[PDB]
């Protein structure tokens, strides 16, 4: 099923093998029957499963070549490497442009999150390091305008569609000119929200295409639909050779895995998936990662961490002031922001041992609160040396009306100010001892 359910079923199937007193055809056939049943609940097309099973079974029986690997590991390696095929061998880069010109055309059935994925592909190209503008060529739908402009004013991206004066083809052409003297480094332009794929999405699309020589045409397709993804992909591949696909809402309904399998079969290059809602939840088809999460591995908690950028270089200059002893008040914010960019992991609450409530925020209910808890503002409302004291808490013992004035100055109560104070000493003693 979804990331978590196929993950567990697949993970469970993988696990039995590790505890193996001897590995035999029988055990093979049952572990392979559990990962057969697992993909089918994720809606991976059953001809697709069949083929992939006898691929693994043959790899795992006839050619039993474990050179310096245990039988188990070389079984795991099989069941791993075949799933990365099942979801498209490798990663399909989006090509950046040199000079000043990349024209990208969004298409999408109403229901998929094309509208949200436009602004999420805007977010990417400011992460990749270019300027991107939004031509909002979908015309009738004025809730589409509403959200998409709101998404654009939160980040920093020019959006052009205005009030309904002109037809689509002409408000594209005038949108491109409006941002071609303003750097046309990438344009992201969406055709409107149509009912079905049957001569509604594409029958329009290539009217819009004919005005602007499209450098990649991306189709935002809803994972929810599962293995109807393929019948979509087929159609778009054929009509448009420069199609890519972006597979959205991986959370939610359990057809995610078979949404992935099905598009990846066509050979229509999957270019993105959506991992959920926030602006940064738009991952660059990390299908190597995703498929690892599926088989498990899992894991995937070191994976996002180590792989990320501020982790080899920028685990140094924070990391010395840590190791000398310059407190943490200057590490709170950094770690709450440098990570604020958020990448969800289970291990987020692995360090703090505490089986009690959720359980379900495994998960980001901390992120969901607009900022990252009320800590910054009592930090600002301390004096710099009130922090830099070798025990700032000692200062709020000795003088008692510091804990009142700093509570009022930040806007907390004294109770929540008292929580931070003892938390600081809690990190301290722990590390000492």
């Amino acid at each position: 099923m979804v990331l978590a359910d196929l993950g567990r079923k697949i993970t469970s199937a993988l696990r039995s093998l590790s505890n193996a007193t001897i590995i035999n055809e029988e055990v093979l056939n049952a572990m392979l029957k559990e990962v057969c049943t697992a993909l089918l609940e994720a809606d991976v097309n059953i001809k697709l499963v069949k083929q992939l099973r006898e691929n693994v079974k043959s790899a795992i029986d006839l050619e039993e070549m474990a050179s310096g690997l245990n039988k188990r590991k070389m079984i795991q390696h099989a069941v791993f490497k075949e799933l990365v095929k099942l979801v498209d061998p490798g990663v399909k880069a989006w090509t950046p442009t040199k000079g000043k010109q990349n024209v990208i055309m969004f298409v999408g059935l109403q229901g998929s999150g094309k509208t949200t994925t436009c602004s999420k592909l805007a977010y990417y190209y400011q992460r990749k390091g270019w300027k991107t503008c939004l031509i909002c060529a979908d015309t009738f739908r004025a809730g589409a305008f509403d959200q998409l402009k709101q998404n654009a004013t939160k980040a920093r991206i020019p959006f052009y569609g205005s009030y309904t004066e002109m037809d689509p083809v002409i408000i594209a052409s005038e949108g491109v000119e409006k941002f071609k003297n303003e750097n046309f480094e990438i344009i992201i332009v969406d055709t409107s929200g149509r009912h079905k794929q049957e001569d509604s999405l594409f029958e329009e699309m290539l009217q819009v295409a004919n005005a602007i020589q499209p450098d990649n045409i991306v189709y935002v397709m809803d994972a929810s639909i599962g293995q109807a993804c393929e019948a979509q992909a087929k159609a778009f591949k054929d009509k448009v050779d420069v199609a890519s696909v972006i597979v959205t809402k991986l959370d939610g309904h359990a057809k995610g895995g078979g949404a992935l399998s099905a598009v990846a079969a066509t050979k229509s290059p999957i270019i993105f998936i959506g991992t959920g809602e926030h602006i940064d939840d738009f991952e660059p088809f990390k299908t190597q990662p995703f498929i690892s999460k599926l088989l498990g591995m899992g894991d995937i908690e070191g994976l996002i961490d180590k792989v990320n950028e501020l982790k080899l270089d920028d685990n140094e200059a924070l990391i010395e002031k840590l190791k000398h002893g310059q407190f943490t008040l200057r590490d709170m914010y950094e770690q709450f922001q440098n990570i604020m960019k958020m990448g969800p992991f289970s291990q987020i609450l692995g360090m703090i041992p505490g089986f009690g409530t959720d359980f379900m925020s495994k998960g980001n209910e901390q992120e969901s609160m607009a900022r990252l808890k009320k800590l910054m503002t009592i930090m600002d409302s301390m004096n710099d040396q009130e922090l830099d004291s070798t025990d700032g808490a000692k200062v709020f013992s000795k003088q008692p009306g510091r804990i009142q004035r700093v509570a009022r100055g930040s806007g907390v109560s004294t109770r929540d100010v008292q929580e931070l104070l003892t938390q600081y000493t809690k990190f301290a003693q722990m590390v000492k001892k």
Partner: peptide, 18 residues
């Protein structure tokens, strides 16, 4: 690098109860 950076990151989250 991966060791300390990852281990400090780890040791910090556990120690800080909130």
């Amino acid at each position: 690098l991966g060791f300390p950076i990852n281990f400090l990151t780890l040791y910090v989250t556990v120690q800080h109860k909130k």
